[PDB]
Prior knowledge:
Chain A is mainly alpha-helical. Chain A is 53% helix and 0% strand. It is classed as ribosome.
Amino acid sequence: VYSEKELGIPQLNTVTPVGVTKPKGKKKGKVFVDDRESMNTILAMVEAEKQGQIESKIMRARQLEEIREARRIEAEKKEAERKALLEN
Amino acid sequence: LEGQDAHNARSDLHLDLSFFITNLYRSLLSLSLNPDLELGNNKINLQTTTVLLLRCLTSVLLPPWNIRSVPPIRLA
Amino acid sequence: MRPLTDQEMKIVLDKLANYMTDLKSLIAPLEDGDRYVFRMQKDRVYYVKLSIANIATCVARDKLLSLGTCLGKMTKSGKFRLHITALPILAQNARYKIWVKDNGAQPFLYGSNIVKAHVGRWTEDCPEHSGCVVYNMADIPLGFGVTARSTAEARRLDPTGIVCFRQADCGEYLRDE
RNA sequence: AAAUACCACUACUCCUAUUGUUUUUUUACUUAUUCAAUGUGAAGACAUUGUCAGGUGGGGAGUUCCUUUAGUCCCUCGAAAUUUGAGGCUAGAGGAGAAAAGUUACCACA
Lengths: 88, 76, 177
């Protein structure tokens, strides 16, 4: 068993998009996660992946909804940052 | 959650009271400063907010089970 | 000194959630409108107030050595590790807890896995490979580690039998002396 | 260390008064300033904001300084007085680039 990171395996385009791939052996732009909203969404993902299977449908719905709300709040936070830096 | 069956269901069913505990802790002050406290075999349908808060605090501070497991920080 | 990236906090929070229950409180704002953040100097991770981090940014990179509480180190393979320095947060917000007698705490202080013969108190309903903080009967936090068996198997286990695998003990303070 | 009689000087510490200057703290008020509205009200001399000197900068854009050694007892700064320490000069030695790279008589597994 060997890692696909070790092997020079190209990325394949599936239902999950490849996106703008980054060149090998080059500077990939480090994106720093420092907004409390961004830690909110990451922590929500971690807690969901840890808790796992909840029997109650409404509980599943609520954990998924808090994930979506964290993503949303991050989205308006980034949009506000963009507007601030674009006009002011 | 103090029903025996739900008591045993607890962890397997992922039943947590933390939100209610925090709500009680954050609402004690309004319950202190509101006027209608004493304008009033049943376990829920009690007409007085004073006895309602008494049941709340008995449940939290002295739950009928695992009396020697209550978090000291919550206690204090 | 840099803030963590997305994958790095994914890994760090995975470890902290494997041994802890609440982390929104960890990242919760304080009364004075300040919050705890995560930073990486060299290869070690650190839990510290934002104000302290912003006041410590003047120190040259090569001239910084500590900041807040060291929660562990990222490894050359990109895998996080916890430390005896990261213990107190785990003590504050632990998921599972195991208490050992003096005659096992002294072994655990020398770096030995706990066994049924030395355990004296348990948390009911504990999975086999769970996250347990090791205390004594005087509730001083002594370490953290992974349980060897579940609770029932621990009960029916031979008393000369490992119940919790050591992963970090207080003796490292006698190493870095 | 310094020796007292004699008479000459300026050196600070602690108080007083008026024949005066500034700097800082607290309090009070609107004229500095901030917010709301259109075809005047409130806050308040604090914030906010601007200009230089700096510290850091693993983020963004562009291109391919200190330490040691030996010397003239040649210059500057700090200290102490009957000498030192830190720099300065001469020329040897150290420190494609945030992607990751190199290494170990060590550890675990295979």
